[PDB]
Design a protein around this nucleic acid. Structure first.
Lengths: 22, 30, 129, 56, 99, 141
RNA sequence: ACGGGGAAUCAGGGUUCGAUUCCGGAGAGGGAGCCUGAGAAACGGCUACCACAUCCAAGGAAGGCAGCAGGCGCGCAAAUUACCCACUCCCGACCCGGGGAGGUAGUGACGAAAAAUAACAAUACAGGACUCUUUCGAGGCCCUGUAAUUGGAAUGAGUCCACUUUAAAUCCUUUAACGAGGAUCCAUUGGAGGGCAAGUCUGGUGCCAGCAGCCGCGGUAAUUCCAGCUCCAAUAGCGUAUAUUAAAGUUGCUGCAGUUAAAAAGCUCGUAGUUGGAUCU
RNA sequence: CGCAAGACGGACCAGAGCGAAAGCAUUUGCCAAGAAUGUUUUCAUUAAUCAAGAACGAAAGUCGGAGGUUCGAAGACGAUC
RNA sequence: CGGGAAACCAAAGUCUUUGGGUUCCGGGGGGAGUAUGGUUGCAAAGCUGAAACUUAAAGGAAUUGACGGAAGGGCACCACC
């Protein structure tokens, strides 16, 4: 996987994780 | 068994390491 | 900026000896530089040198006999005791037959052999061989 | 990951008894025998550097 | 590993160079890096020069020329065969082709 | 470059102390996290109870079935898979008996083609596996 | 994490360790408070509470081994419920009494030192050794040894005597009597592809069983597994698992590295820090 | 033929210049700054690098207000596959 | 000159003949710039930043070949025209 796209996927994971955590 | 011939033939086989040792014995005190 | 003018002088001498030159121009001059050069010259490594007097800080033109392999400075000037001198000679000198460590002692600036003769430790200035 | 085969080869190997042999020397005598065989005996070596356990 | 000492461009002593557009693909390519061709071509092609000259109202008209500056990206300049790949040694030759 | 001053001892010492934490062995041996994660807890050996026998497949380049036992340590109750070294030695081990288990020789690292196994059985039922293997001793009744 | 003296390699520099017999400190299941006394916040002193725990006729009474031994438990992990004040010292009203301090002990391979398991033939042999006259021929002149034909000499391991030793004693030492020819009075532990010393010999197994720290070996002619023989490494000692040191100039003070292998902050000011030009007899 | 909007500043334009970097190109004027050079001017170590702190920092992105030509993530279609 | 593994670099030289001053910073490859804590931000996110576990290599420079829906020049009715 391209490193930029790996970072984008990780950032989307973090966005969902911070969405679920309040 | 020629130590040099054995080295030239199967230095790159399962017996390459032992064949190298036998070659070094024939040449010098290795 | 330029600190440790002795380091610059010794580096210039070393670089000119590597290049095979007969004379090197050292500036600025200093008392410690002159003493180090005198210690070098007493042992036949460097030959005669002339101090050019400009009215601010002298320059020195040093004739170069091809006898010098390396001259170096030791920074910082570690205080060396007479019992730690042998370790310094093993670290710095090519052999025990030739090569000198130049110390600065209260008895003046001299090589390690003289410093052991006068029973003085001091501060290490550099070395030459 | 069947454990049924375990010690199969040590099980099916023919059992050969150790032959009875003269006891070997120990200590200084064993070292003396080694020294005599390796440095006092020159006959086996004509200069081809053969190993002590060469069976070919 | 560094292929070229100038990094394939002509930028020394500056940070940013304004981009231009490749004449073929409209790619954004820096002006220093881009491959530039200055084409000074007759408006009338050499085959049609005689026929246009005869039909000229004015004798000795000397027909005009076309002045078009061409900017190329590396991909389009290589594909168009304006530049070619060269050996590791011949790459350093900066002399323009004698033509 | 590095600082060379007569009064730079504190800087050199602090830099070395901070840079030592970028050494894998130093961080492992001084952080204390690898110690709590160690099933042996810093011990060389441990005694456990054989929960079951398991055969782990060798790593890809060569094919075999490695006779291991899943053991539970007595000191901390942790679950451990330990290799039973020689051949037929899995038959010397019965389910639910005490075994003395040591490391595999690489300080917590897996050894050889056995995947994820860093422990080996030394004694079973207070008699060494080598004595049972060589026939010097029999399994206690 | 009790501190130190100090302990584990020597290039130089260092890195780890120090519960542990000497010195200092602290504690006596956990806290706390006291009496006596010169000296204790004492625990082989007391008084409470907390946690455990002993006898009881159930009213009550009595506890503190991190002293020597011994138990249980915990564990990978550690000894005898022995003898004695003869020594070293200590204590007392004391030349006289006492001391599990301390000294002495049938199964302690923690570790360290010394050191057995053999030393000397006629003989055929593969031999060679000072000018060997002969490939068919002096070879205890010098040495090695396949040995189902040899031979005497030496001695301690052991068993016992004499009580040397010692506070009755064991032990070393000493003297006697037996005690060695498969001197059966029988040395082991790990290996034999390489690293790394030493068999692509034989049988079995056939990517199985297993070996293998690493690289690799094993898929019917395995130099690597299971074995036989032979070989070699150390040797009464070897293997293994962990922690640690050197190797590691892979923590670099000596002494590393930072374009592309891991790496110089996007850039510039800036306080502390570090460093700082010549010049005095 | 004109008119109006925003955007941009071709060719000249270079292994040329300037800036700490990001970056900077139509004319003219104003404002403050700057390097180098020249100096037989002045001060006379006032310096170098810099934890802490601080200024600036392409593009994209966010919140308000204008503007909204061109291009254009998203999106809507059309296409050999 | 010199240095580097070389590519290359008048610096990436003046380095086992190793010390001019000073800041930042790396320690096999993954896990991972992830989790968590703190801190900044409206948000997007920024800064600081592990470990368990996993692995014998990953990687750098270059050399030969092979291959290229890469270029140049040639050739063949087992190619085409």
């Amino acid at each position: 996987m391209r490193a930029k796209w790996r970072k984008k996927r990780m950032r989307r994971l973090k966005r969902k994780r911070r969405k679920m955590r309040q | 068994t020629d130590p040099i011939d054995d080295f030239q033939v199967n230095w790159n086989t399962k017996h390459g390491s032992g064949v190298t040792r036998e070659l070094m014995r024939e040449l010098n005190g290795g | 900026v330029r600190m440790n003018v002795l380091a610059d002088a010794l580096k210039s001498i070393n670089n000119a000896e590597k290049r095979g030159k007969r004379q090197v121009l050292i500036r600025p001059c200093s008392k410690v530089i002159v003493r180090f050069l005198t210690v070098m010259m007493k042992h036949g490594y460097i030959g005669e040198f002339e101090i050019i007097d400009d009215h601010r800080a002298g320059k020195i033109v040093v004739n170069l006999t091809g006898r010098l392999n390396k001259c170096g400075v030791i920074s910082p000037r570690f205080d060396v005791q007479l019992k730690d001198l042998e370790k310094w000679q093993n670290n710095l000198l090519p052999s025990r037959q030739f090569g000198f460590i130049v110390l600065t002692t209260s008895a003046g600036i001299m090589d390690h052999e003289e410093a052991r003769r006068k029973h003085t430790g001091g501060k290490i200035l550099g070395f030459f061989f | 990951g069947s454990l049924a085969r375990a010690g199969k080869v040590r099980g099916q190997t023919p059992k050969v008894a150790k032959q009875e042999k003269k006891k070997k020397k120990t200590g200084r005598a064993k070292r003396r025998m080694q020294y005599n065989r390796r440095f006092v005996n020159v006959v086996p070596t004509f200069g081809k550097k053969k190993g002590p356990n060469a069976n070919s | 590993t560094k292929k070229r000492r100038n990094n394939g461009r002509a930028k020394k002593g500056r940070g940013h160079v304004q981009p231009i557009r490749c004449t073929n693909c409209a790619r954004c390519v820096p002006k220093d890096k881009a491959i530039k061709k200055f084409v000074i071509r007759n408006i009338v092609e050499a085959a049609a020069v005689r026929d246009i000259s005869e039909a000229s109202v004015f004798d000795a008209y000397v027909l005009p020329k076309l002045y078009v500056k061409l900017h190329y990206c590396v991909s389009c300049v290589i594909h168009s065969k304006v530049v070619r790949n060269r050996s590791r040694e011949a790459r350093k030759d900066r002399t323009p082709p004698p033509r | 470059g590095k600082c060379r001053g007569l009064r730079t001892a504190r800087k050199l010492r602090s830099h070395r102390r901070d840079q030592k934490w970028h050494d894998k062995q130093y961080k492992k041996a001084h952080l204390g996290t690898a110690l709590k994660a160690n099933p042996f807890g810093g011990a060389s050996h441990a005694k456990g109870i054989v929960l079951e026998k398991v055969g782990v497949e060798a790593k890809q380049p060569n094919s075999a079935i490695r006779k291991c036992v899943r053991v539970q340590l007595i000191k901390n109750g942790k679950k451990i898979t330990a290799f039973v070294p020689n051949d037929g030695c899995l038959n010397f081990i019965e389910e639910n008996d005490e075994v003395l288990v040591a490391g595999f020789g690489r300080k917590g690292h897996a050894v050889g083609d056995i995947p994820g196994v860093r422990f080996k059985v030394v004694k079973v039922a207070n008699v060494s596996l080598l004595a049972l293997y060589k026939g010097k001793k029999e399994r206690p009744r």
